[PDB]
Structures are given as C-alpha cells and as structure tokens.
Amino acid sequence: PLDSQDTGAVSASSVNEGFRADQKSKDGETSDLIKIPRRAYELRFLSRSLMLNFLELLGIMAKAPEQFPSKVENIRVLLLNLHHLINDYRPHQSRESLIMLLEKQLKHEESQVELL
Amino acid sequence: GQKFCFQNLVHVLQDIRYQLSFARLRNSDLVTALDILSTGTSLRLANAPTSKLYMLSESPLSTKQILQTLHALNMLIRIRLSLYEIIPTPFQHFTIAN
Amino acid sequence: PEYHYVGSVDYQPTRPSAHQNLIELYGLTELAKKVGRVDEFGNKRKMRRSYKAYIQDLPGYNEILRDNTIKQWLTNPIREEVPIDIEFLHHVFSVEPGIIPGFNPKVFGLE
Amino acid sequence: LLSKVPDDKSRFEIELEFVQMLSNPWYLNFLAQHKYFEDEAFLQYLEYMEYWREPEYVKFIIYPTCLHMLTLLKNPQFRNDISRADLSKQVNDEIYYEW
Amino acid sequence: CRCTQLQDTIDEVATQFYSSIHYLSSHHDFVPLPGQEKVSDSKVNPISAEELQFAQRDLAKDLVTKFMQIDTLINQLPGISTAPKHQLEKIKKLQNSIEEKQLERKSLESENEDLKLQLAKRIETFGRLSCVLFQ
C-alpha cells in the first residue's frame, strides 16, 4: 500500500496502549506478583498465554481432531498481536539507530578537523 | 477424515506462519537508503570488480581540478625522482615540466 | 488473573474413537472371519485372483474377458422396456442345419 | 510514424517497473542480444529514466540496483559485454554475493 | 538488533509448532489393541517405541526452552517512550553540531590548502636547484 499494514485490518486486536512524552508506565499486578514494565508485561502475558493455548491444541488433537479450527484461531490472533506490538516498538529503534549513525558522522568530522 | 484433520491442521499452521513473516517489520537499512539519496548503490559498485572495471565516471571533468591534478602529479614525480633509486648519469639533468 | 482464549470452548471427545477396536464395534469380525488371510483355525485362505471360483460351477469352457460395457449401460441406461414380436423372431431364428466354418465347440466344453 | 498512444498515470507505473527490469542482469543480457542498444531512441529513453533518480520519484523505486545498473550501462563497451554470457554471470554472481 | 532477533524467536516458535506436530504424525504410530500389529512397512517407515517417547520428550523440552528464551528476551527489553520528542531533539542538536563543526573545518581547510601551495612552491625551487647544482 502507500502506508504499512494494520493489525486491526487483518483480525481482532487484543489490547491498545500509548505512552506519554518523556514518561513510561509500569505497574504492580499479581499473576506471579510482578512489578515490572507495562508493555513488556502485556507481552510476557500474551506469550505464556500462547504456550497454554498450544497445550490446549495438542489436547484437542488427541481427543477430538475436528475441533482444531477454533483453537488454531486462538493461536493465530495471539501471534499476530505479539507482532503488531513488537512493531509498535520499532520506530524508536530506527530513530536511535539513525542517532548512533549521525553520532558516527560527527565523530569522524571532529576527528578529521583535529587531524587537519 | 481423522487423518485429513491432522494434515489440514499442519497446513493451517504453515499458512499462519507465512502470514507471520508478512506481519513483522525489520529495522530500516538506512545505509542503502542514504546511498540511494545520491542515486547510486555505492555498495554494489565498490564491492564489485566487474563494476569497477566497467564503471565509468561522470562526464564532467573540472578543468581547475585537472590543473591541480597536474600540479600534484608533477610534484609527485619530483617526490619519486628525488627518492627514485636509479637515475642514469646522462639523465641527471631533468625538468619537471607542465 | 486469567489468560485469554484458554478453555474458551468446551468440547466432548469425538464420537467414535480410534482407540476402540472398530472391527468389533461395527460387527465386521464375521466378515474378517469370512474373507481374511488367516482362517479362525489358523490355516491359510486361498482366494483366486480371478472369479474362477464361480465359473467353476457352470457348464462350458468359459474364458474370462474384460468388457466395460455394463458400466456404459449404466452411464446411458435405457428406458423402461423394449418391444418384442415373438412371431417375427420365431421366423427369423429357423436356421438350416448346414455347418458353420471357422467355429470350434471348445467354448461348449462338453468334452 | 504512428501516433503515440500512451497513458499518463500508466506510464509512470510502467517506467517504475522498467527501471526495476533494468536492475535484473539477465534482462540486460537479453536486451543486448536483441540489439536494443543499437537504437539511439533507446539511449534517449535511458536518459529519460534519469528522472527516476529524483527523491520523490526514487522514493517509489523498489530495487536499488537498477540505478547503479543504469550508470553502468552508460559505457557502450559494457553494453557489448552484457551481450556476453560470461560477464552476465559475473554480474549476477556479484549481486548474489552482496546479497 | 534485540527487537528483530526476538521477532525471529517467536517466528521460530510457530515453525516449531507445525514442525513438531508433523514430525510426530510422520513417524510410527501403529497400536495393536486386542489384535496383532501389522504394517504397510513401506508407507509406514516405523520408529522405535522408545525412540518415539524419547523424541516427543525432546520436542517438549525444545519448545519450553524456546518459550523461556522469549521470556528472558522480554526482560532484556528496555522500556522506551513511544513519543519521539526526546530523540528528535537529540537529533536536531547533533545536526546543528555537525553543521558548525563542518563550517570550522571548511575555513581551516581553505587556509590549509593555501599553505600547502606555498610550501609546495618552496619545495619545487629546492628540488630543481639541488639537482642542477649537485649534478
């Protein structure tokens, strides 16, 4: 397309979020009594959840194979959400990589000036 | 039908893995992008011997440049010759021309 | 405190299970007794590759031929009946006793 | 002299795709075998492809190689050697390695 | 770097899902019940019962280790503001900085090349003079 692909466009999106400028959210909620960053927690959560849904899948294979479509759908949305969210992480990473590059050019510049 | 079930599941899992590669996004190759700002793939040329042999420069030659090349060239023959090991004695007088 | 999509749908196991011996379940064991490689006493069951076992009963030397016409008679089945004029066929079928060349009665297999 | 029959939008979709073709070395080899480099009209159309280096336009191009390929093709001896199969394989292998 | 690799790890997990199930379906399953085991040996391509158990245990271990790796990578993950204002401002500072350093370099570089020309002339005098006089 003219812009990148959208997760809501492909299937249902399990969560939404936004972080303020120069501030990050972390809270203490109880599954194993975690006190850690909020985006990462939603992630870990989705992952352990995926693990469990797969265990389910194995079961429904050994007990009743024709039922799998439902469960593999569970799986699919879990993976797609994992990715959409990791994607939300990237633009900052691309920006900071550009930063490090510009920093390299400056370093070459000042070093070349002093050498001259 | 039960077997068909097993297989069918495997195919669905492959398919969603395919969609998975379609959904991830990878950090930009800024290097190539900046090279293409200047309209060449600087990488593919420098790297390649067949490029460098068949490469050809842009047609403008700065005539002030080529004078300065000449100056640096003559000057560089002076460098060479002063510290070039072997001059024949009939050649001992030389002019570093234009 | 609950993970998503876990136990969202309940399902009972599949109605017939592979783990059950289905030969017994659907009463094919008498069939297996009747057609299996091994007798129920343990002796081997010989089965002609051809259907000679049924031609064996019938008179005449009978060759086994391959003709897919009855299949075609099923692809293009015919209407309900055909007209039949006994008198005409009686007339048509009176034939003179003279011999017929090139035909042997081996097919009859009387002797 | 048949009257031109072009489309506006379509020919920039097309000229984008053509630049892409130029990225492929085997397409260059076939092109040379077909002696398309004999025609001066072609070479003027190449310079018309120079419009695709412009930022708003190059922002659209997908395979960077073509650009390089284009500057490579400005040497005619290069054209006769991309007629050659050996050099063709050399070029393909050179990308493959960069890749 | 980190983010792309973790992305690769979840992809690795999906691939492990269908790979695992397929491996298991592919390899021997015959179970006799009452009756005697019998195989279509060619199409079957059996594997040992012990080989089976060991292989599925191994498969479980591999998958759970993959999940642990994803978890620990999620911990490796440093929290960052989605807002780019801090980064953008840094960016602008660097650009201005390299701009002024480049101007300084340019001035000192023109003075450099002028100097170089001067010394080069004195050199040239020396070289021709020395050659002629000693030879």
UniProtKB/Swiss-Prot annotation, chain A:
Chain coiled-coil ranges: none
Localization in the cell: Nucleus
Basic and acidic residues bias (residue ranges): 19-29
Protein origin, superkingdom: Eukaryota
Annotated protein name in UniProt: Mediator of RNA polymerase II transcription subunit 7
Biased segments, Polar residues type: 4-16
Residues of the whole record sequence present: 186 to 301 of 376
Similarity section: Belongs to the Mediator complex subunit 7 family.
Oligomer status and interactors: Component of the Mediator complex.
Signal peptide span: none
Role of this protein: Component of the Mediator complex, a coactivator involved in the regulated transcription of nearly all RNA polymerase II-dependent genes. Mediator functions as a bridge to convey information from gene-specific regulatory proteins to the basal RNA polymerase II transcription machinery. Mediator is recruited to promoters by direct interactions with regulatory proteins and serves as a scaffold for the assembly of a functional preinitiation complex with RNA polymerase II and the general transcription factors.
From Swiss-Prot, chain B:
Subcellular location field: Nucleus
Described function: Component of the Mediator complex, a coactivator involved in the regulated transcription of nearly all RNA polymerase II-dependent genes. Mediator functions as a bridge to convey information from gene-specific regulatory proteins to the basal RNA polymerase II transcription machinery. Mediator is recruited to promoters by direct interactions with regulatory proteins and serves as a scaffold for the assembly of a functional preinitiation complex with RNA polymerase II and the general transcription factors.
Subunit (UniProt): Component of the Mediator complex.
Entry's family note: Belongs to the Mediator complex subunit 14 family.
The name this protein goes by in its record: Mediator of RNA polymerase II transcription subunit 14
Originating organism: Schizosaccharomyces pombe (strain 972 / ATCC 24843)
Gene (name only): med14
UniProtKB/Swiss-Prot annotation, chain D:
Compartments it resides in: Nucleus
GO-annotated biological processes: positive regulation of transcription initiation by RNA polymerase II; regulation of transcription by RNA polymerase II
Residues spanning the membrane: none
GO MF annotation terms: transcription coactivator activity
GO cellular component: core mediator complex; mediator complex; nucleus
Main location: nucleus
Top-level taxon of the source organism: Eukaryota
Keyword tags: Activator, Nucleus, Transcription, Transcription regulation
Cited function: Component of the Mediator complex, a coactivator involved in the regulated transcription of nearly all RNA polymerase II-dependent genes. Mediator functions as a bridge to convey information from gene-specific regulatory proteins to the basal RNA polymerase II transcription machinery. Mediator is recruited to promoters by direct interactions with regulatory proteins and serves as a scaffold for the assembly of a functional preinitiation complex with RNA polymerase II and the general transcription factors.
Similarity section: Belongs to the Mediator complex subunit 31 family.
Subunit comment: Component of the Mediator complex.
The protein, known as: Mediator of RNA polymerase II transcription subunit 31
Designated gene of the protein: med31
Parent-protein start and end of this portion: 6 to 104 of 139
From Swiss-Prot, chain E:
GO MF: transcription coactivator activity; transcription coregulator activity
Any GO CC annotation of this UniProt entry: nucleus
Subcellular location field: Nucleus
GO BP term (any one): regulation of transcription by RNA polymerase II
Family matches, as Pfam families: Med21
Coiled coil: 85-126
Similarity annotation: Belongs to the Mediator complex subunit 21 family.
Function according to Swiss-Prot or TrEMBL: Component of the Mediator complex, a coactivator involved in the regulated transcription of nearly all RNA polymerase II-dependent genes. Mediator functions as a bridge to convey information from gene-specific regulatory proteins to the basal RNA polymerase II transcription machinery. Mediator is recruited to promoters by direct interactions with regulatory proteins and serves as a scaffold for the assembly of a functional preinitiation complex with RNA polymerase II and the general transcription factors.
Subunit composition and interactions: Component of the Mediator complex.
Name of the protein this chain belongs to: Mediator of RNA polymerase II transcription subunit 21
UniProt organism field: Schizosaccharomyces pombe (strain 972 / ATCC 24843) (Fission yeast)
Encoding gene per record: med21
